[PDB]
């Protein structure tokens, strides 16, 4: 049956982690709060049984995720704190993000206020700017892997579909996985690069401001059809400045979209209010951003 250890030992680093509260599954992984027995620090452990990694192609995908994520360090990227293995499991040690993800926020709040959307989108963009400048395309940016720490700071996570651009002008021809907010050039199998991440942020912005994703249908294949045909509409109550930026990012032609470095210079950010921080209450109650308290 094979059972997960209660204490996880890294023989190289000599660090031991006591397995705590179950957090949920993430793909092939069962995830847990894990705490270092010496420093008492808490991390999110991702635990993958090798019995699900029998195919070299699976191991290579798991290897590449680790290889990419371990190379990154940024305020808006999930912290990578180690990985190790025994004969039965791969153990990955990640930054624990105690407020889960924007997916759980979205399920509770639906459409956010515009300043909340600017706030989160700014941090998503800063993290993605960092990725692209280090030649990493994430390829799976979605509400569920945009994690939130205690301070409601965004941490981009789940590098399971990410890839490294190895040379200038390289077009990736293959994406082995099913991303949520999939760019049309991936779907049409015509070669893709960094612009797919800007498509996805486009979709995240729409979802954050509208309360639902732009191309949703009752069948994934019908969704793909719509994406390829660029069949979406922005509700009339969305402000023209926001709607303009969504439109720019959601263009069929990847070369037409803004690049990650242009986004924060958009009128959407520069001429609107961006809170310095959000109160914890924003997880459940719309903020009014009032100037003083009564
Ligand atoms: C490690 C994988 C991925 C990741 O990459 N990081 C960095 C991550 C960082 N932080 C967290 N944090 C929490 C995630 C879930 C919960 C939570 O409360 N889960 C409840 C458990 C019982 N269940 C009935 C209802 C859900 C609490 C978290 O922090 C206190 N999760 C992360 N995940 C997730 C772990 C499962 C899917 C993805
Ligand atoms: Zn494959």
Asked if residue 192 lies in contact with residue 175, where contact means CB atoms within 8 angstroms, the answer is: yes
Exposure string of 264-287, with b = 16+ CB inside 10 Å and e = fewer, is bebebbeeeebbeebeeebeeeee
- Pocket residue to mutate for ligand 1, from 27, 93, 100, 145, most atoms within 8 A of Cβ: 100
- Pocket residue to mutate for ligand 1, from 34, 41, 44, most atoms within 8 A of Cβ: 44
Asked if residue 99 lies in contact with residue 44, where contact means CB atoms within 8 angstroms, the answer is: no
Which phi and psi angles does 262 have, rounded to 5°? Answer: -95, -20
Which residues are within 8 A (CB) of 13 and not within 5 positions of it... i.e. 6 or more apart? 82, 84
Which ligand has an atom closest to residue 22 CA?
Answer: 1
| C-alpha atoms less than 13 angstroms from C-alpha of 50 in its C-beta half-sphere | 9
In angstroms, what CA-CA distances link 288 with 112, 194, 206, 237, 293? 11, 36, 21, 18, 11
Which residues of the chain does CATH 3.30.200.20 include? 12-100
Q: Cα of 55 to ligand 1 centre, how many Å?
A: 27
Atom of ligand 1 nearest to the CA of 44: 1
Superfamily holding 12-100: Phosphorylase Kinase; domain 1 (3.30.200.20)
Separation between Cα atoms, residue 64 and residue 158, nearest integer Å? 12
140 as an active site residue: the answer is: yes
Nearest to 127 by CA among 219, 21, 260, 7: 260
- Pocket residue to mutate for ligand 1, from 31, 78, 81, 150, most atoms within 8 A of Cβ: 31
Separation between Cα atoms, residue 162 and residue 138, nearest integer Å? 4
Atom of ligand 1 nearest to the CA of 92: 1
Which CATH number is 101-273's, of 3.40.630.30, 3.40.50.1000, 1.10.579.10, 1.10.510.10?
Answer: 1.10.510.10
Burial class (CB in 10 A: 0-12, 13-18, 19+), 97: buried
In angstroms, what CA-CA distances link 80 with 65, 146, 147? 11, 15, 13
Separation between Cα atoms, residue 112 and residue 171, nearest integer Å? 35
**What are residue 24's DSSP bridge partners?**
31
Q: How was this structure determined?
A: X-ray
Closest residue by Cα to atom 22, ligand 1, is 23
Asked if residue 122 lies in contact with residue 264, where contact means CB atoms within 8 angstroms, the answer is: yes
The active-site residue out of 36, 86, 88, 140 is 140
Rg of the chain over Cα atoms, rounded to whole angstroms, equals 20
Question: Which tokens go with 258?
Answer: 């803004």
- Sign of the torsion angle spanned by Cα atoms 252, 118, 208, 21: positive
SS (H, E, C) the chain: CCCCCCEEEECCCCEEEEEEEEEEEECCEEEEEEEECCCCCEEEEEEEEHHHCCCHHHHHHHHHHHHHHHCCCCCCECCEEEEEECCCEEEEEEECCCCCEHHHHHHHHCCCCHHHHHHHHHHHHHHHHHHHHCCEECCCCCHHHEEECCCCCEEECCCCCCEECCCCCCCECCCCCCCCCCCHHHHCCCCECCHHHHHHHHHHHHHHHHCCCCCCCCCHHHHHHHHHCCCCCCCCCCCHHHHHHHHHHCCCCHHHCCCHHHHHHCHHHHCCCCCCCCCHHHHCCCCCCCCCCC
Binding-site residue positions:
23-31, 46, 95, 142-145, 158
Q: Cα of 289 to ligand 2 centre, how many Å?
A: 47
Ligand 1 lining (C-beta closer than 6 Å): 22-24, 26, 31, 44, 46, 78, 94-98, 100, 147, 157-158
Separation between Cα atoms, residue 247 and residue 203, nearest integer Å? 10
In angstroms, what CA-CA distances link 167 with 134, 180, 193? 12, 27, 11
**How large is the greatest C-alpha to C-alpha distance in the chain, in angstroms?**
63
Which residues of the chain does CATH 1.10.510.10 include? 101-273
Question: Which tokens go with 235?
Answer: 């509700």
Which phi and psi angles does 285 have, rounded to 5°? Answer: -130, 130
End-to-end CA distance of the chain: 60
């Amino acid at each position: 049956a094979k059972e997960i250890p209660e204490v996880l030992v890294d023989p190289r680093s000599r660090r031991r982690y006591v397995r705590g509260r179950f957090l949920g599954k993430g793909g092939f992984a069962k995830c847990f709060e894990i705490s270092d027995a010496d420093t008492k620090e808490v991390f999110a452990g991702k635990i993958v049984p090798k019995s699900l990694l029998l195919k070299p192609h699976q191991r290579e995908k798991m290897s590449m995720e680790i290889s990419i994520h371990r190379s990154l360090a940024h305020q808006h990227v999930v912290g990578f704190h180690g990985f190790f293995e025994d004969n039965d499991f791969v153990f990955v040690v990640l930054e624990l993000c105690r407020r889960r993800s924007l997916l759980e926020l979205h399920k509770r709040r639906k459409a956010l206020t515009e300043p909340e959307a600017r706030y989160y989108l700014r941090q998503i963009v800063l993290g993605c700017q960092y990725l692209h400048r280090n030649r990493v395309i994430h390829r799976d940016l979605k509400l569920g892997n945009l994690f939130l720490n205690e301070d409601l700071e965004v941490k981009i996570g789940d590098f399971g579909l990410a890839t490294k651009v190895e040379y200038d002008g390289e077009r990736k021809k293959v994406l082995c996985g099913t991303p949520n907010y999939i760019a049309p050039e991936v779907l049409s199998k015509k070669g893709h690069s960094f612009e797919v991440d800007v498509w996805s942020i486009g979709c995240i912005m729409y979802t954050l401001l509208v309360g639902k994703p732009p191309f949703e249908t009752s069948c994934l294949k019908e969704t793909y059809l719509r994406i390829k045909k660029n069949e979406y509409s922005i509700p009339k109550h969305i402000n023209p400045v926001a709607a303009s930026l969504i439109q720019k990012m959601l263009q069929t032609d990847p070369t037409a979209r803004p690049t990650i470095n242009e986004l924060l210079n958009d009128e959407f950010f520069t001429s609107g209010y961006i809170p310095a921080r959000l109160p914890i209450t924003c997880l459940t109650i719309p903020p009014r951003f009032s100037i003083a308290p009564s």
